[PDB]
Design a protein around this ligand. Sequence first.
Ligand SMILES: *[C@@H]1O[C@H](CO[C@@H]2O[C@@H](C)[C@@H](O)[C@@H](O)[C@@H]2O)[C@@H](O[C@@H]2O[C@H](CO)[C@@H](O)[C@H](O)[C@H]2NC(C)=O)[C@H](O)[C@H]1NC(C)=O
Ligand SMILES: *[C@@H]1O[C@H](CO[C@@H]2O[C@@H](C)[C@@H](O)[C@@H](O)[C@@H]2O)[C@@H](O[C@@H]2O[C@H](CO)[C@@H](O)[C@H](O)[C@H]2NC(C)=O)[C@H](O)[C@H]1NC(C)=O
Ligand SMILES: *[C@@H]1O[C@H](CO[C@@H]2O[C@@H](C)[C@@H](O)[C@@H](O)[C@@H]2O)[C@@H](O[C@@H]2O[C@H](CO)[C@@H](O)[C@H](O)[C@H]2NC(C)=O)[C@H](O)[C@H]1NC(C)=O
Ligand SMILES: CC(C)(C)C[NH2+]C[C@@H](O)[C@H](Cc1ccccc1)NC(=O)C(c1ccccc1)c1ccccc1
Ligand SMILES: *[C@@H]1O[C@H](CO[C@@H]2O[C@@H](C)[C@@H](O)[C@@H](O)[C@@H]2O)[C@@H](O)[C@H](O)[C@H]1NC(C)=O
Ligand SMILES: CC(=O)N[C@H]1[C@H]([C@H](O)[C@H](O)CO)O[C@@](O)(C(=O)O)C[C@@H]1O
Ligand SMILES: *[C@@H]1O[C@H](CO)[C@@H](O)[C@H](O)[C@H]1NC(C)=O
Ligand SMILES: *[C@@H]1O[C@H](CO)[C@@H](O)[C@H](O)[C@H]1NC(C)=O
Length: 527
Amino acid sequence: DIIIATKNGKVRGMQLTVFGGTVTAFLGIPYAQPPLGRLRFKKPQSLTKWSDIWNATKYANSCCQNIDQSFPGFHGSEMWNPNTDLSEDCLYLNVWIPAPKPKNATVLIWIYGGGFQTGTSSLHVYDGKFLARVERVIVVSMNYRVGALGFLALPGNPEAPGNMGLFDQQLALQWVQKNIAAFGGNPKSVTLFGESAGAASVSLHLLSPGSHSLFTRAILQSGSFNAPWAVTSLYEARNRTLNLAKLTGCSRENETEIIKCLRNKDPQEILLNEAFVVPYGTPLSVNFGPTVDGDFLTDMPDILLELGQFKKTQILVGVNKDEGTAFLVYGAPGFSKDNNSIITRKEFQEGLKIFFPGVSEFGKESILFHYTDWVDDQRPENYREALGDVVGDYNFICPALEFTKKFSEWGNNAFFYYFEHRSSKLPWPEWMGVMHGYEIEFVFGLPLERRDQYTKAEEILSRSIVKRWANFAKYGNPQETQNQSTSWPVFKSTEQKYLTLNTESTRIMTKLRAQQCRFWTSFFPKV
Ligand SMILES: *[C@@H]1O[C@H](CO[C@@H]2O[C@@H](C)[C@@H](O)[C@@H](O)[C@@H]2O)[C@@H](O[C@@H]2O[C@H](CO)[C@@H](O)[C@H](O)[C@H]2NC(C)=O)[C@H](O)[C@H]1NC(C)=O
Ligand SMILES: *[C@@H]1O[C@H](CO[C@@H]2O[C@@H](C)[C@@H](O)[C@@H](O)[C@@H]2O)[C@@H](O[C@@H]2O[C@H](CO)[C@@H](O)[C@H](O)[C@H]2NC(C)=O)[C@H](O)[C@H]1NC(C)=O
Ligand SMILES: *[C@@H]1O[C@H](CO[C@@H]2O[C@@H](C)[C@@H](O)[C@@H](O)[C@@H]2O)[C@@H](O[C@@H]2O[C@H](CO)[C@@H](O)[C@H](O)[C@H]2NC(C)=O)[C@H](O)[C@H]1NC(C)=O
Ligand SMILES: CC(C)(C)C[NH2+]C[C@@H](O)[C@H](Cc1ccccc1)NC(=O)C(c1ccccc1)c1ccccc1
Ligand SMILES: *[C@@H]1O[C@H](CO[C@@H]2O[C@@H](C)[C@@H](O)[C@@H](O)[C@@H]2O)[C@@H](O)[C@H](O)[C@H]1NC(C)=O
Ligand SMILES: CC(=O)N[C@H]1[C@H]([C@H](O)[C@H](O)CO)O[C@@](O)(C(=O)O)C[C@@H]1O
Ligand SMILES: *[C@@H]1O[C@H](CO)[C@@H](O)[C@H](O)[C@H]1NC(C)=O
Ligand SMILES: *[C@@H]1O[C@H](CO)[C@@H](O)[C@H](O)[C@H]1NC(C)=O
């Protein structure tokens, strides 16, 4: 029985058997007073000391959120759905501690994705016990508010200022600064890592001055704030805040009076109307996302990035080979996860309309022109693959590369990876390839568990990835120095070298998606 004295009280954990060893888990430590009642839509508020022993032995409530029901019973979609009760009382974090208790361990803080509308830290694929066991780091993860409850914006109005979920993340990094030493952890050696909107979140903490002293280094898996889906304009945010008021009968003239109205509505009523605040949306639609609030974010982040206004430190950034495919089976015509989804030119063009709704006829033709120059014109999957590349290059790969270029231009070491292994346990069909989100289990070390039917080559790939992630958090340098491994070079704006991650030949390559990204990063912003 291990009890830890934190700043606000004692917490009891629990023991776990991992690989003939022991990890100490603290699941469900509160880090803010529950944002209920008059606290809904507001920045998170500090906790009051408890004199008893807090029992942190089970994952806490997930935050309120809509669920993906597009494939009931299918593990491929449902593995991402919340696995604890939804509740507005959801501001909790988890801590995995090596046993024996470490003395000054590096801390890894995980921030989940979910498009800022969904997600939870209790997912099986986010279990931090393998990393604590195998690398003797401490793994922390937190729940943060999501959707309207986390990102509703009336700028300047502290009843609904925006970016609340980001301030939730920040208050948990805060908790680690005040408390992780009591757990054996080094508050001066804290690496943030996250995927999808979690990675975009990590990139925004690099930008937010209030977060600059709360971490050391940063890892961005398939996401960054300059991705088109990652920041909600103040224009959209107003229209979206107002439209939500209409759909709930909360339209008022006094703006603070609207919030008070929205505070009486039941959680499900806010959730149900979230989906309709956007007239024409995409499968990627971030209804309520990060905004330029003037608090967490002082200016438009493209400007801060371009002019070097961010925390100076090392970054590790990467993307997966087929980022874009997962979104095609959520609306694109001719697509299904249950067939090979051979689409025609006309279906492709219809697909562009779904993913670029408010884009001119000429914009859509330019995408078609740039992606329909086939090496062979007789390949039937030509249009199926091109639509995936469009979505993945536009929404993920090119923004990540551009983020890495601009960030490294200010003198810091950057490392970029290209993950191209398709999991042997992947429930989605083979034509979707190396999907968005399916590097996560390798980062967290799930194939290190021999019982789990991953191949041996997958064990070795995870083992190396886990070593490189830990070496990056510990020492700023994602090498595997012992076994005779390919050395990972720094990413520089001239050479743009990156490391490929796969079971076979790990290689050094240059200028990923160069032709594709000059289209998206240089030409397409004009249309
Ligand atoms: C725990 O270790 C820290 C040092 O952490 C390292 O240095 C960081 C800058 C960063 O590079 C991390 O990834 C490293 O692991 C100790 O911090 C020092 O504490 C003394 C206080 O006596 C202070 O005078 C020094 O300035 C601190 N910084 C450094 C760089 O030495 C800390 O004391 C250690 N604590 C325990 C309990 O072991
Ligand atoms: C800004 O909002 C207006 C209206 O808000 C919502 O529109 C629908 C999505 C509905 O679900 C309700 O929440 C609100 O009425 C948008 O204007 C609508 O646009 C659609 C098509 O673009 C049109 O068919 C409707 O008649 C319009 N309704 C009104 C009242 O104008 C508008 O498009 C949003 N965006 C911008 C940039 O103005
Ligand atoms: C691949 O499947 C899509 C989706 O169709 C659904 O899923 C199938 C597996 C099957 O169970 C169908 O009954 C389902 O409707 C097919 O697209 C549909 O094609 C039909 C007939 O041409 C058309 O009426 C629908 O509008 C299409 N639906 C969508 C969402 O596009 C597609 O034709 C299949 N392609 C191949 C190569 O198998
Ligand atoms: C794996 C991950 C942790 C990333 C999420 N698990 C999948 C599921 O929970 C959520 C549900 C959702 C849907 C729409 C808006 C918000 C959330 N889907 C995504 O998060 C993802 C996406 C995948 C496929 C089809 C559409 C969307 C995305 C959404 C917005 C921006 C970028 C990616
Ligand atoms: C918190 O937990 C206390 C201990 O209960 C037991 O603790 C360990 C040693 C395990 O055996 C565990 O499975 C047991 O449940 C309780 O005595 C205490 O009442 C609990 N407090 C609250 C508020 O629930
Ligand atoms: C048709 C259906 O509902 N499920 C089928 C799945 C799906 O197509 C998955 O998305 C891809 O595993 O694929 C199988 O054929 C397969 O190879 O295991 C089994 C099953 O018949
Ligand atoms: C709106 O209502 C709040 C609370 O009653 C009040 O403090 C504020 O001054 C009002 N503003 C306007 C413009 O009516
Ligand atoms: C290096 O290889 C040995 C086998 O000789 C293996 O046990 C170990 O886990 C490997 N280390 C890494 C970091 O992959």
